[PDB]
Structure 1
């Protein structure tokens, strides 16, 4: 095994060097009232990492629209990072606009538990989604061999943000859940007094005292969510390789 920070803990305090200069996590993001997705990759100048970083750049304004910043992690140098970014701009025509953490001896890696058994020296494809309070809201561990579905990360942070906003719980596959479509869920009641009270109010739709829901999501909220998935699903019109 190996240690990781846990959902509901504040992200570990740490000063990191990135290719945008030094930043203290998670405060930098907290102080701007912003979320950050931090995401690790094994090595600059490798192809899946490239496809991955292009995906994240291609959706930068989708993440800016939600008040979420991006930050890569990798044990390559700051000089390695800027030359890789220069490659991608040159050979693919994409500026990579967000900073990348440099971590040469593996300190930040070790701290976030990003060294698994594939490799003693290269991080896995780890994802830490953090809220404006500086709290880890979700963690994904993808291997070396498999690139992430960046659109699922978007659905997470939108869904989470509606949840806290609307005091609600998000069903499976939202906003295309097969039971209650784009319905958000009301936290199950923890006493019999709330159970009965809630039922009597008919302020909600109900399958039973625990499963109560409604559609407080704005039309645009739901479309923002559904675009994320339409895009994930859509075969690409042109490929960025046919202009390189």
Structure 2
């Protein structure tokens, strides 16, 4: 078990691209990662999820975000199942995938549902400081929407680079579209600052605690 804000546990993992250390192997290059588990090789929802992830991989990579899978299966199945996707949907898998033996890493991370020994569908966003920024736990029976995660990481990068909070559904927020939110003033002094920034056209606002601006 884990929470948002913790550092990703240091671990060695056997993958399809060889043995690597987490978080370090991504963090040391300044890259983030999205860790996602699925129940098993040669299962149907997962195949749809992998194929969707490969079709999206460069969008993640472009952002300095590396996708990486996990199941409790051995590497030979991982590779045979990647080959099936390449041969039947004509999409080569180029992100690496963890052969988490005996759910060792799955367990440290809370990936295994009640009563099971296999993982469901989990997603961890780990930044390049190795900090877990967000977590998703979806059941076997429901496939993910990778676009939500792409949106999530994008919002996370922008939060970081510009010191802002993103609103519901950004960049299509109902009320303010792709404008970003200013952290609410938490003191009377910070309320003074907001008032000033507004009365000189630097932010818009519905109120002192609710300020926003174009990026």
TM-score w.r.t. the length of structure 2 is 0.96
Aligned residues: 212
What residue is the counterpart of 2:55 in the other structure?
Answer: 58
Structure 1 residue runs without a partner (length 5+): 217-244
What residue is the counterpart of 2:207 in the other structure?
Answer: 208
Q: 1:104 Cα shift?
A: 2.2
Q: Distance in 1 between matches of 2:193 and 2:34?
A: 39
Q: Distance in 2 between matches of 1:200 and 1:90?
A: 61
Q: Distance in 1 between matches of 2:80 and 2:6?
A: 35
What residue is the counterpart of 1:100 in the other structure?
Answer: 97
What does 1:94-243 correspond to in 2, within 5 Å?
94-117=91-114, 119-202=115-198, 203-216=202-215
What residue is the counterpart of 2:85 in the other structure?
Answer: 88
TM superposition outliers: structure 1 runs of 4+ over 6 Å: none
Q: 1:199 Cα shift?
A: 0.7
Q: 1:95 Cα shift?
A: 0.2
CA contact (8 A) 1:5 1:12 kept: no
Does the residue aligned with 2:27 lie in a helix, a strand or coil?
helix
CA contact (8 A) 1:41 1:123 kept: yes
Residues 1:6 and 2:16 are matched in the alignment: no
Q: Distance in 2 between matches of 1:49 and 1:197?
A: 50
Residues 1:44 and 2:41 are matched in the alignment: yes
Deviations 1:5-54 (A, max 9, x none): 11111111111111111111000000010010000000001010100000
- Among 20, 31, 35, the residue aligned to 1:34: 31
CA contact (8 A) 1:57 1:94 kept: yes
Deviations 1:107-156 (A, max 9, x none): 01111111112x52210100001111111111011110011001111000
Deviations 1:139-179 (A, max 9, x none): 01111001100111100011111111111000001111111
Deviations 1:220-239 (A, max 9, x none): xxxxxxxxxxxxxxxxxxxx
CA contact (8 A) 1:125 1:142 kept: yes
What residue is the counterpart of 1:78 in the other structure?
Answer: 75
TM-score w.r.t. the length of structure 1 is 0.85
